[PDB]
């Protein structure tokens, strides 16, 4: 095995598993490693383009390297967590708002 | 502009933190991610002030 300075062309195998959508996961689409929900998507790609970016170059839709199916993406949900309350001097009850 | 600032190295090895994670985990990871944090922190602060 000689590893010449040029990039190595013959490599080991790629152990690829199944893809599940409508519930966010970490994902590994050949470099694309974000964290979000994948879903079916409609917008059409050209025969060779490989990502989908948008207004500020955020990875925004990707096609599976195995099957020609465009998938849309959205980062996992998240938001503030706050508490409304009557004063401690009038009660102790508490209602919580997820933002 | 703020979001665009995430696509810059600020003098580190890359513009993603995951790649530096992959390449080098021991101290040099600190002496690199230092710069990512410093730069991104400025960008946020200089958004807040104006």
């Amino acid at each position: 095995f000689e590893l010449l300075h040029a990039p190595a062309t013959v490599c080991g195998p790629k152990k690829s598993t199944n893809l599940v959508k409508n519930k966010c996961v970490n994902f590994n689409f050949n470099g694309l490693t974000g964290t979000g929900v994948l879903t079916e998507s409609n917008k059409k790609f050209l025969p060779f383009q490989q990502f989908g970016r948008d207004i500020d170059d955020t990875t925004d839709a990707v096609r599976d390297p195995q099957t020609l199916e465009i998938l849309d993406i959205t980062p996992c949900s998240f938001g503030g967590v706050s508490v409304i309350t009557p004063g401690t001097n009038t009660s102790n009850q508490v209602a919580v708002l997820y933002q | 502009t703020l979001v665009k600032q995430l696509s810059s190295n600020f003098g580190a090895i890359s513009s993603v933190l995951n790649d530096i994670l992959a390449r080098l985990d021991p101290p040099e990871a600190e002496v690199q991610i230092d710069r990512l944090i410093t730069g991104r922190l400025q960008s946020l602060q200089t958004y807040v002030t104006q």
Binding site: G79, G80, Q99 | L6
Partner: peptide
């Protein structure tokens, strides 16, 4: 159903983001 007034509708029709943000 939205009781915007008429000239207010003209005004409205005239005038014309999730990497860690949110708009309340």
């Amino acid at each position: 159903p939205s009781k915007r007034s008429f000239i207010e509708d003209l005004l409205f029709n005239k005038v014309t983001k999730f990497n860690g943000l949110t708009v309340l």
